[PDB]
Design a protein around this ligand. Structure first.
Ligand code: 6FA
Ligand code: NDP
Length: 367
């Protein structure tokens, strides 16, 4: 029993979780941030950290340095809604007056990294990836969504002498929600960089392929019988909302996508003190780091507003903002529903990939 006192538990230390923890910390509200890793991952820059020697150490930020005893490393395995408890692997339990679920998404390395690991092992995993790319003259990227087009562009921009093939199962590249003008310009930039495109083809022997590892010879096969020989295979084949921590407890509340249904105040439907933020929230908006941060501000604010019997803040989407870096010198996208060009995207995203914003939030300086 908390007897009216606040204790907020945040499950997930991604873009959403560190924003929520930073604000609760500034408000002196008791809270615990739980993450399976020992450091925040600026995963927007994970593909650049896969091609540039020495960059990976700019993409991982120690939780304990920023949050100290308000941070607990661990894997959440269930939520006990009756006794308001966050269940950790190992048996430990965390009581909460309010729960913020910020579990993000999972997917293949290198675009996502969700291993229980130390900070130096995580950085080394990306430095090893750089070494695999450097050893490999021929490289195949599988999947031409927004991650795969960025991956292929990063490789050919850093290493123009390598041979890069992107294999994609659809006719057009990147997200279907994007303006057709954006999707066509993505294709043209890749072709001008020398990336070979194999569109409307599905790689069919994924079980048989060594992944993220240089080999003298790998044969990639497609459902149409195309065969590509390569030294290296990288999967950018998509992500899944990470519902492990909460799927059982909230099964009745889950969208199809695995997200949690929520109102414009981001409380989970059926609950007044549970919030979902970021990728695991059924925003129906695109899953974006910057939206996770905005959701966190809304979530923390209505926890406080709700204790002050005040009216709640509301999340209202606008047109789609979506920026694709195409290596450090190029890119294309849209800012709230209109096309923005290559100079704009290069300056806004491609050069720095928003890395400095996470170090600022965490109040740390990059090594
Ligand atoms: C891959 C990629 C993504 C981009 C990219 N670009 C942009 C961009 O330009 N702008 C943007 O806003 N988003 C961009 N994104 C999307 C952005 O990465 C995601 O939308 C963002 O990470 C979502 O933030 P969340 O806070 O919702 O989730 P995270 O995945 O960041 O963090 C979740 C955390 O929960 C932890 N966790 C999950 N389940 C757990 C459990 N059961 N126990 C403990 N910890 C758990 C995970 O380990 C992880 O640390 C991009 O170029 C690439 C290549
Ligand atoms: N710049 C940004 O803001 C970025 C944002 N994101 C976010 O992350 C989300 C996921 O993006 P992404 O990670 O690119 O995942 P996506 O699911 O968007 O793209 C993955 C693609 O890979 C294709 N694919 C899967 N298996 C194969 C195969 N065996 N052979 C060939 N093609 C295959 C899929 O086609 P099928 O589905 O037909 O199998 C799909 O079109 C985005 O929706 C966005 O919210 C990610 C990267 C950049």
């Amino acid at each position: 029993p908390h007897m009216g006192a606040l204790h907020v538990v945040i499950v997930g230390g991604g873009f959403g979780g560190i924003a929520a923890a930073s604000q609760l910390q500034a408000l002196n509200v008791p809270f615990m941030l739980v993450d399976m890793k020992d450091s925040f991952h600026h995963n927007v820059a994970a593909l650049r950290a896969s091609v540039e020697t020495g960059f990976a150490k700019k993409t991982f930020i120690s939780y304990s340095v920023t949050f100290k005893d308000n941070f607990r490393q661990g894997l959440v395995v269930g939520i006990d809604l009756k006794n308001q408890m966050v269940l950790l692997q190992g048996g430990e339990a965390l009581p909460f007056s309010h729960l913020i679920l910020a579990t993000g998404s999972t997917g293949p390395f290198p675009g996502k990294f969700n291993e229980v690991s130390s900070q130096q092992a995580a950085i080394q995993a990306y430095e090893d990836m750089v070494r695999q790319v450097q050893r490999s003259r021929f490289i195949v990227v599988v999947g031409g969504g927004s991650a795969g087009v960025e991956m292929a562009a990063e490789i050919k921009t850093e290493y123009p002498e390598k041979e890069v093939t992107l294999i994609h199962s659809q006719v057009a590249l990147a997200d279907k929600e994007l303006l057709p003008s954006v999707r066509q310009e993505v294709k043209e930039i890749l072709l001008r960089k020398g990336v070979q495109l194999l569109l409307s083809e599905r790689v069919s022997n994924l079980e048989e392929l060594p992944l993220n590892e240089y080999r003298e010879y790998i044969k990639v096969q497609t459902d149409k019988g195309t065969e590509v020989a390569t030294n290296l295979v990288i999967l950018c084949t998509g992500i899944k909302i990470n519902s492990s921590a909460y799927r059982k407890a909230f099964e009745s509340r889950l969208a199809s996508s695995g997200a949690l249904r929520v109102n414009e105040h981001l409380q989970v439907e059926g609950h007044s003190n549970v919030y979902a933020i970021g990728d695991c929230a059924d925003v129906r908006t695109p899953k974006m780091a910057y939206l996770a941060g905005l959701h966190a501000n809304i979530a923390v604010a209505n926890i406080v507003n709700s204790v002050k019997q005040r009216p709640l803040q509301a999340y209202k989407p606008g047109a789609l903002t979506f920026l694709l870096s195409m290596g450090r010198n190029d890119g294309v996208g849209q800012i709230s529903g209109f096309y923005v060009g290559r100079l704009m995207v290069r300056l806004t995203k491609s050069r720095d990939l928003f890395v400095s914003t996470s170090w600022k939030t965490m109040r740390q300086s990059p090594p």
